[PDB]
Structure formats: structure tokens, C-alpha cells
Design a protein around this motif. Structure first.
Motif, PDB file in Angstrom:
ATOM      1  N   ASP A 143       0.824  -1.214   0.000  1.00 48.99           N
ATOM      2  CA  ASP A 143       0.000   0.000   0.000  1.00 48.99           C
ATOM      3  C   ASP A 143       0.855   1.259   0.000  1.00 48.99           C
ATOM      4  O   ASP A 143       1.790   1.371   0.787  1.00 48.99           O
ATOM      5  N   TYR A 192       0.867   5.457   0.501  1.00 53.78           N
ATOM      6  CA  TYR A 192       0.125   6.476   1.242  1.00 53.78           C
ATOM      7  C   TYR A 192       0.453   7.877   0.748  1.00 53.78           C
ATOM      8  O   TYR A 192       1.609   8.181   0.448  1.00 53.78           O
ATOM      9  N   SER A 193      -0.564   8.730   0.668  1.00 54.21           N
ATOM     10  CA  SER A 193      -0.338  10.140   0.371  1.00 54.21           C
ATOM     11  C   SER A 193       0.330  10.825   1.557  1.00 54.21           C
ATOM     12  O   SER A 193      -0.025  10.574   2.710  1.00 54.21           O
ATOM     13  N   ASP A 240      -2.289  16.690   1.414  1.00 56.71           N
ATOM     14  CA  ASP A 240      -3.712  16.852   1.156  1.00 56.71           C
ATOM     15  C   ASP A 240      -3.925  17.402  -0.250  1.00 56.71           C
ATOM     16  O   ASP A 240      -3.323  18.416  -0.625  1.00 56.71           O
ATOM     17  N   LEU A 247     -11.367   2.217  -4.496  1.00 52.15           N
ATOM     18  CA  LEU A 247     -11.331   3.570  -5.044  1.00 52.15           C
ATOM     19  C   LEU A 247     -11.846   3.623  -6.482  1.00 52.15           C
ATOM     20  O   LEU A 247     -12.522   4.578  -6.865  1.00 52.15           O
ATOM     21  N   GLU A 299     -11.353  14.031  -2.473  1.00 52.67           N
ATOM     22  CA  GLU A 299     -10.420  14.496  -1.455  1.00 52.67           C
ATOM     23  C   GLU A 299      -9.417  13.418  -1.060  1.00 52.67           C
ATOM     24  O   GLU A 299      -9.794  12.338  -0.598  1.00 52.67           O
ATOM     25  N   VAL A 300      -8.138  13.715  -1.275  1.00 52.18           N
ATOM     26  CA  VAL A 300      -7.059  12.893  -0.748  1.00 52.18           C
ATOM     27  C   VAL A 300      -6.496  13.577   0.494  1.00 52.18           C
ATOM     28  O   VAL A 300      -6.042  14.723   0.427  1.00 52.18           O
ATOM     29  N   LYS A 301      -6.536  12.875   1.622  1.00 55.49           N
ATOM     30  CA  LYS A 301      -5.946  13.374   2.863  1.00 55.49           C
ATOM     31  C   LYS A 301      -4.591  12.717   3.130  1.00 55.49           C
ATOM     32  O   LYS A 301      -4.362  11.579   2.728  1.00 55.49           O
ATOM     33  N   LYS A 302      -3.695  13.446   3.798  1.00 59.17           N
ATOM     34  CA  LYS A 302      -2.427  12.889   4.269  1.00 59.17           C
ATOM     35  C   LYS A 302      -2.686  11.590   5.036  1.00 59.17           C
ATOM     36  O   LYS A 302      -3.526  11.552   5.934  1.00 59.17           O
ATOM     37  N   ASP A 360      -3.869   8.762   3.641  1.00 59.28           N
ATOM     38  CA  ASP A 360      -4.800   7.914   2.887  1.00 59.28           C
ATOM     39  C   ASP A 360      -4.047   6.932   1.993  1.00 59.28           C
ATOM     40  O   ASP A 360      -3.024   7.286   1.414  1.00 59.28           O
ATOM     41  N   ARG A 361      -4.569   5.707   1.885  1.00 59.46           N
ATOM     42  CA  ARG A 361      -4.067   4.707   0.942  1.00 59.46           C
ATOM     43  C   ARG A 361      -4.577   5.046  -0.448  1.00 59.46           C
ATOM     44  O   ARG A 361      -5.790   5.110  -0.666  1.00 59.46           O
ATOM     45  N   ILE A 362      -3.651   5.231  -1.386  1.00 57.64           N
ATOM     46  CA  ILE A 362      -3.957   5.845  -2.673  1.00 57.64           C
ATOM     47  C   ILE A 362      -3.682   4.910  -3.867  1.00 57.64           C
ATOM     48  O   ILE A 362      -4.266   5.070  -4.940  1.00 57.64           O
TER      49      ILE A 362
END
Lengths: 132, 127, 131
Positions: free
Chosen positions: C29, C31-32, C35, C68, C102-105, C107-109
Motif C-alpha cells: 500500500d 500512502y499520500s 492533502d 477507489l 479528497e485525498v488526505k495525508k 490515505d491509501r492511494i
């Protein structure tokens, strides 16, 4: 047994318009693919971009047509389809998607994608009653 | 182990097929009917579960014809070696017409992509 | 046992160590680290603030997360990481949905898969059956 060497990626030009695939560095995942023709791809449209090469892939892989990173991040370009079978002997085509708001210009000789030799299994299929 | 094992989860499923001994993927069939509007997505159930051979994952990949003619793409598509659920295909319709899927239509292909399962290590900085 | 080691380094305080959801999961995974607001029908380069060193005989594929895609119409562009790439790992996210994403710090991206490949030399022939 008797012979000891390495399999090569073989290609033949289908016209004068093709460019031989190139690799940027020794450890680059893929060979650059070049358009043999001019294309204007309108916003939210697709095009089949011909390379005018045919390839013979080494045994035990398929050829994945993969996106160039710069074109994706900058111009909202994506690559559709992209599965070149080991036994495919036709003209290598690249399906380009233009998701951007502006038209995208492809000129003959432009790098539009990359070709990766992905190692795969060719397994036999067996139906079972239930899995675990 | 070494073969691709599958089981049907309903009578609506079709056994995956391969056109050639050297074709990269097994074709996957829709078990149900879907109308996918322009600029929309759908998850298409196959009603099969699969057990992938050891040392690979299953990549759900686009069929070339569907991409070039109909602007159909495949989203998601990573099936883990240990996944035993119903195989669902995420289809994206970027075309301007609605795209019709009926039971028995070939909608994607399944490729056994060989991978490493590496252990992870943190280092201060990489050269 | 070969050098089957994925090595990583953090480039900032905002990075999260990649994790694997299961023993036989295809990818780690990603992560971002920041934000992001991705408008409808738009793209963004999402930085992880990590650098990686892939094992020999593979490249790193940045691949989409299933949820997603299915729920939010999110896709991953580009995504080929060369063996010798030592830069910041960026994820190109496409939002094809009709609403902002919205992508937050933290988050699995995306996920990172070590795809086994071959590095053949290229040979030009006049016909494919030339000897």
C-alpha cells in the motif's frame, strides 16, 4: 543442451515511417515506441496509433504497452488495451486516450508509449466444485 | 499450485477460455446484464472464484477490440493470489453511447503476472 | 534466498511506511503524504515522499486500489517505476467522477507491485523468420 545464449526481442519494419524501438538506459523497464503517422486526438477521444513494426516476443512473456509518465502527468494521456500476445505478428498499435481539455498532437517520430516484456505463466485451467 | 483452478458460483457463469496456446490471458465472461451509460462505471460479476498459481497475481486486463472501438477501459484489476471471492470486473465507459453487456459477453481477460513478494526494509537514505 | 528486498527511505516527516494487507498480497500500500483536492475530470500527482530500491529482475508498477475504482471512479495513470529510479514516488491519480475527490495525508492511494520482467536486447530483421 548444446546451445547457450540469450533470447532477443525481434522486430521488422513494415514501412519507411517506422522508428526502431530504443531503450533510454540499461535498467529501463521498456522500449520506447514511436508513432509512424500524424494524429490529432480531440479532447475526450481515442486514437489507434500505428508504429508500423511487427515484433516477435521472447518465449514466456507478453508485451505490455504502457504509458509514458510525462504524457500522463502533463497532458492527461493514457494508454488503453495494451496486451500484445507472444504470438501476435501484426502491426503494433497503441490505443491512446486523451482525457485532457485540449486536443493532443501526435507527429510521426514522437515517442507515445513503452513496451515491457512482462513474465507470465500460461497455466492449464481446471474446474473444481468449490475452492479453499 | 501450478494450474488455474476455478469454481462456478451460479449457473450463469461461463468457464474462461483462451484463444491460443500463447495468448496472454483467459477471457472472462459477464454472468449478468448491464447497461453502462456514457462516462459511467459498472462492476460486472463473472460468478466465478479463482485459485491462481503460486508466484503470480491475476491481472484483469482490457480486451483490445473493446478499447479501440468502444472506448472501454478496465479499472482496478489486481486479484491477489489468496483472493477467493466472486471475480468482479470494473468497466469504465468513456464512449458517447451507452455500452451494453449481456450474459455471456466477453468483457476482459485474465493474465497470470509473475511477481516477487519482497520483504520491506527502511534505510536512512538511498544513494 | 536472493536479494528479495524492497528498500525504502523517507524523504520527509509526512511519509508513511508502505504496508502489505496479507502475506500473499500482490502489492504494498502507498500512502499520500499531502492533502489534495482533485476536481471532476481532472488529474493530480500525489507525492508519497518515499524513494525505493526495487529488487533485481523487476520493475515497480503503481497499481490502483479496487475500492477507489469501483466506488469513486478513481484511476491510476503512468505508473512504471524503473529499477534504477531513486526519486520521489509520485502517483498520478485520475478522477473521472462527477464530484471532487479528497485525498488526505495518510490515505491509501495506490499499491506497488514488483512485476517480474526480462531485459532482452533488440534485433532488427527484414523478415521475422530470418536465420
Amino acid at each position: 543442451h548444446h546451445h547457450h545464449h540469450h533470447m532477443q526481442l525481434r522486430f521488422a519494419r513494415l514501412s519507411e515511417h517506422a522508428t526502431a524501438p530504443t531503450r533510454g538506459s540499461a535498467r529501463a523497464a521498456g522500449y520506447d515506441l514511436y508513432s509512424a503517422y500524424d494524429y490529432t486526438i480531440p479532447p475526450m477521444e481515442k486514437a489507434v496509433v500505428k508504429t508500423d513494426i511487427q515484433i516477435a516476443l521472447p518465449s514466456g512473456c507478453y508485451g505490455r504497452v504502457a504509458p509514458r509518465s510525462g504524457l500522463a502527468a502533463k497532458h492527461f494521456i493514457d494508454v488503453g488495451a495494451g496486451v500484445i500476445d507472444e504470438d501476435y505478428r501484426g502491426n503494433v498499435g497503441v490505443v491512446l486516450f486523451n482525457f485532457g481539455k485540449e486536443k493532443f498532437e501526435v507527429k510521426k517520430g514522437d515517442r507515445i508509449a513503452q513496451l515491457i516484456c512482462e513474465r507470465i505463466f500460461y497455466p492449464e485451467i481446471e474446474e473444481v466444485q468449490a475452492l479453499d
